[PDB]
Structure formats: structure tokens, C-alpha cells
Design an enzyme around this catalytic site. Structure first.
Site, PDB file in Angstrom:
ATOM      1  CG  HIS A   1      -5.760  -2.621  -0.495  1.00 54.62           C
ATOM      2  ND1 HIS A   1      -5.068  -1.951  -1.484  1.00 54.62           N
ATOM      3  CD2 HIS A   1      -5.531  -1.936   0.650  1.00 54.62           C
ATOM      4  CE1 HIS A   1      -4.441  -0.916  -0.957  1.00 54.62           C
ATOM      5  NE2 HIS A   1      -4.708  -0.881   0.336  1.00 54.62           N
TER       6      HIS A   1
ATOM      7  CB  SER B   1      -1.041  -0.087   1.114  1.00 55.19           C
ATOM      8  OG  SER B   1      -1.739  -1.314   1.036  1.00 55.19           O
TER       9      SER B   1
ATOM     10  CG  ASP C   1      -5.523  -1.653  -4.992  1.00 53.31           C
ATOM     11  OD1 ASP C   1      -4.803  -2.525  -4.467  1.00 53.31           O
ATOM     12  OD2 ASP C   1      -5.846  -0.581  -4.429  1.00 53.31           O
TER      13      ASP C   1
HETATM   14  O1  LIG Z   1      -3.877   2.185   1.447  1.00 50.99           O
HETATM   15  C1  LIG Z   1      -2.903   2.974   1.297  1.00 50.99           C
HETATM   16  O2  LIG Z   1      -1.909   2.957   2.076  1.00 50.99           O
HETATM   17  C2  LIG Z   1      -2.857   3.889   0.099  1.00 50.99           C
HETATM   18  C3  LIG Z   1      -3.862   4.146  -0.812  1.00 50.99           C
HETATM   19  C4  LIG Z   1      -3.485   5.028  -1.837  1.00 50.99           C
HETATM   20  C5  LIG Z   1      -2.209   5.527  -1.769  1.00 50.99           C
HETATM   21  S1  LIG Z   1      -1.471   4.782  -0.366  1.00 50.99           S
HETATM   22  C6  LIG Z   1      -1.729   6.343  -2.777  1.00 50.99           C
HETATM   23  C7  LIG Z   1      -0.334   6.526  -2.968  1.00 50.99           C
HETATM   24  C8  LIG Z   1       0.135   7.284  -4.035  1.00 50.99           C
HETATM   25  C9  LIG Z   1      -0.756   7.846  -4.947  1.00 50.99           C
HETATM   26  C10 LIG Z   1      -2.116   7.647  -4.780  1.00 50.99           C
HETATM   27  C11 LIG Z   1      -2.592   6.878  -3.709  1.00 50.99           C
HETATM   28  O3  LIG Z   1      -4.029   6.692  -3.577  1.00 50.99           O
HETATM   29  C12 LIG Z   1      -4.424   5.449  -2.984  1.00 50.99           C
END
Ligand SMILES: O=C(O)c1cc2c(s1)-c1ccccc1OC2
Ligand SMILES: *[C@@H]1O[C@H](CO)[C@@H](O)[C@H](O)[C@H]1NC(C)=O
Length: 354
Positions: free
Chosen positions: A300, A145, A253
């Protein structure tokens, strides 16, 4: 179990100024080291960081961390659970900086919180060199993530750090799980007027200024001042990297769907085409990534889950693909490393998580 060590350099801190740290289980017979970065979203202003401090405090502070943790998935030391690297030295680095592992700012008279993710990684590596990392042959920087995005942002800096410290024999590699996102158009759209309405590109642009965020040098030189948010999107930062990086990403995702304002609660034509197009765009971004594992599932994270060995693409599991990648870095007959599903709807692969 892996055992907690708080950092000896106590100026490298979690959000609230408590010391950062790492959990370690050594394997004296092994020259392989696995350093895993935890995920868990991020925060980008005073109001949303304050709310995270009330109800997600372990992601902002070390004060309540336990003395040990159990290694699971790729962090398990049992070959039954981890066919790939069960005998490696294992390190779990908790995510307590809320900055996608990019920050370099301290708590001060001007800053309610410290955002030190990039400095936490460097300080862990430096303190491990005295605990056996100096003898390593391979350092695999892995993460899930926000930690997967953190691998893309930090793997080349770890390689540079070790070269400048006098350890050019350590091969630095990356494993980025569930951190490869698209700056695509949302299924429904809102202007950035609060936390829930702010799209990722806008939230990350604000975060970088709030965190004093840093990105890899070649990517920074391409996009330049004010545009460093681009380097948080895997398909843009990956081609600038020099270290070998294996990319793991579900084609559908759940975090991608969340930021796109999709909530699967019967699907009509507009949403069916949107979901199919998302899978096709993800597949297209992986076409020139030689080491990748991308199943057609709605899920995820993968690599620290206990049943991570169950999913397969074209008959090959992830632990097998990672082993084939190791062999490739010494194509191979029956040992593939590029595994991307082509079927167009979630769960068209029968091995998807239930
Ligand atoms: O679940 C988590 O940790 C994350 C979810 C997202 C993250 S990190 C993210 C990182 C860079 C660019 C866009 C992003 O949108 C979704
Ligand atoms: C402690 O960490 C800070 C911030 O990364 C760094 O500037 C300093 O040199 C470090 N000191 C030691 C002794 O490691």
C-alpha cells in the site's frame, strides 16, 4: 526540511475550523513544482467523524502540526533518494478534510465539521503563485491513497483554475499512487448497517451528501444526479480527464483487500480464485492507460517511501518510468512508460517490498 505555511485565507479550513496549510521547500533554480496530497481514509457521518477526531486528530485539525517535515521519496531533495525530481520545488499538503479531497462545505450552525478538500487545493495553488509558481513550466499534482484518488478528482480543476487566472504556459499533470480502486463484489458480504459493514460505494454515496462533494465536470455530466459516487473509482473517471495522468497501483493493494473483506492471516480454493481474479481485473482496467506502473505485490502506497526506488517491473524502476514519461511529453528506445505485471499471485515479482 519543508516549512509550514498556514493559509492566509482562514475561511479555508480543516474539519474543526482550524486553518488548512501546506509545507514548502523552494528550489530557486527550478521551474518544476511538485504538489503532493496526503492520504488516510475518510469519514462519512457524525458518529464516525467523532471517533476519528479522538484518535486521528492530525487528519482533522492543524492545531498540533509541527513547524517542519522531512521530505522523503519523491519529496526528497537528495538525488541518491530521488533520481526523478530531486531539484524541484516541493510542496506537501496535509490531509485534514476527511473527504477524499472532494468537499466544498464550511462549519456552520447546520454542520459540526467543515469538508473543504477541493477548496484547500485551489487556495494552496493561488497562494503559491505569489511565491514562485507563476514562473513554472510544469505543475505535477501527486498523491497517495485518498490523495491519489484526490489527484483524479482535482487535476483538471487545477488546470482550469490556472487558465482562468492567466497562466496558460504552466503544464498541469497528475501522478495518482494507490488510489485506483474497484467497486467489485466482496469476498464476504454485509449490508451497510454501520461503519465496518458499509461497502465503499455505499459509504461514498453517503459521504458526498455529508461533505457537499464535487467531482470533475465531464464525469458528473455522464453519471448525473445521485450517481456521482461513480467518479471516485479510477477506471470510470480517468477516461473523462484531459490532463496527462500517470497511474501507480499495486495489483493486490492492501486497502482493496480490506474493503473486500479479505484478511490474509493456508489459502483454500475459493480465496485463491478470488485473489487471482482481483489481479486480473486490475490489469484489465489498466490495459488502455499508457502511463502506468503496477507491480504484482501485496502492499500500500509507494511514492513517498524512502526505498521507493527498489521495486521494478520488467527491469524498470518507478523513478525511471517517470523520467521516460517526462521525455514522452516533450515510443522511446529502452525507456518504457506502460509497466504492468502479468504474473498472477502476490510476490511473484522478486522486487516486491519485504
Ligand atoms: O487508505 C486510504 O486513504 C483509502 C482507501 C480507500 C479509499 S482511500 C477509497 C477511495 C475511493 C474509493 C474507494 C476507496 O476504498 C479504499
Ligand atoms: C477565501 O476562500 C473562500 C472559500 O474558498 C472564497 O470564497 C474567497 O473568495 C476567498 N477569499 C480570498 C480573499 O482569497
Amino acid at each position: 526540511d519543508l516549512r509550514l505555511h498556514l493559509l492566509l485565507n482562514t475561511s479555508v479550513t480543516c474539519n474543526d475550523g482550524s486553518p488548512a496549510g501546506y509545507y514548502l521547500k523552494e528550489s530557486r533554480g527550478s521551474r518544476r513544482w511538485l504538489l503532493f496530497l496526503e492520504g488516510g481514509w475518510y469519514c462519512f457521518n457524525r458518529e464516525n467523524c467523532d471517533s476519528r477526531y479522538d484518535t486521528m486528530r492530525r487528519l482533522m485539525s492543524s492545531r498540533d502540526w509541527p513547524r517542519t517535515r522531512t521530505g522523503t521519496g519523491i519529496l526528497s531533495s537528495q538525488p541518491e533518494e530521488n533520481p526523478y525530481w530531486w531539484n524541484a520545488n516541493m510542496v506537501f499538503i496535509p490531509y485534514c478534510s476527511s473527504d477524499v479531497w472532494s468537499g466544498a462545505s464550511s462549519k456552520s450552525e447546520k454542520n459540526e465539521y467543515a469538508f473543504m478538500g477541493a477548496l484547500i487545493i485551489q487556495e494552496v495553488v493561488r497562494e503559491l503563485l505569489g511565491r514562485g509558481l507563476s514562473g513554472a513550466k510544469v505543475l505535477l499534482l501527486a498523491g497517495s491513497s485518498a490523495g491519489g484518488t484526490g489527484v483524479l478528482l482535482n487535476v483538471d480543476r487545477v488546470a482550469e483554475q490556472l487558465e482562468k487566472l492567466g497562466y496558460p504556459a504552466i503544464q498541469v499533470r497528475g501522478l495518482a499512487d494507490s488510489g485506483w480502486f474497484l467497486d467489485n463484489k466482496q469476498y464476504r458480504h454485509t449490508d451497510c448497517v454501520d461503519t465496518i459493514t458499509c461497502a465503499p460505494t455505499e459509504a461514498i454515496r453517503r459521504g458526498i451528501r455529508y461533505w457537499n462533494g464535487v467531482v470533475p465536470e465531464r464525469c458528473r455530466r455522464q453519471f448525473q444526479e445521485g450517481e456521482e459516487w461513480n467518479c471516485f473509482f479510477g477506471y470510470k473517471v480517468y477516461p473523462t480527464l484531459r490532463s496527462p495522468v500517470f497511474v501507480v497501483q499495486w495489483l493486490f493493494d492492501e486497502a482493496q483487500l480490506t474493503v473486500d473483506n479479505v484478511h490474509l492471516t493456508p489459502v483454500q480454493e475459493g480465496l485463491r480464485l478470488y485473489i487471482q481474479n482481483l489481479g486480473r481485473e486490475l490489469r484489465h482496467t489498466l490495459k488502455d492507460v499508457p502511463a502506468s506502473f503496477a507491480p504484482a505485490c501485496l502492499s500500500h502506497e509507494i511514492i513517498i517511501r524512502s526505498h521507493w526506488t527498489d521495486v521494478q517491473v520488467k527491469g524498470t524502476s518507478l523513478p525511471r518510468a517517470l523520467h521516460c514519461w517526462d521525455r514522452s511529453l516533450h515510443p522511446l528506445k529502452g525507456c518504457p512508460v506502460h509497466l504492468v505485471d502479468s504474473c498472477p499471485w502476490p510476490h511473484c515479482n522478486p522486487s516486491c517490498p519485504t
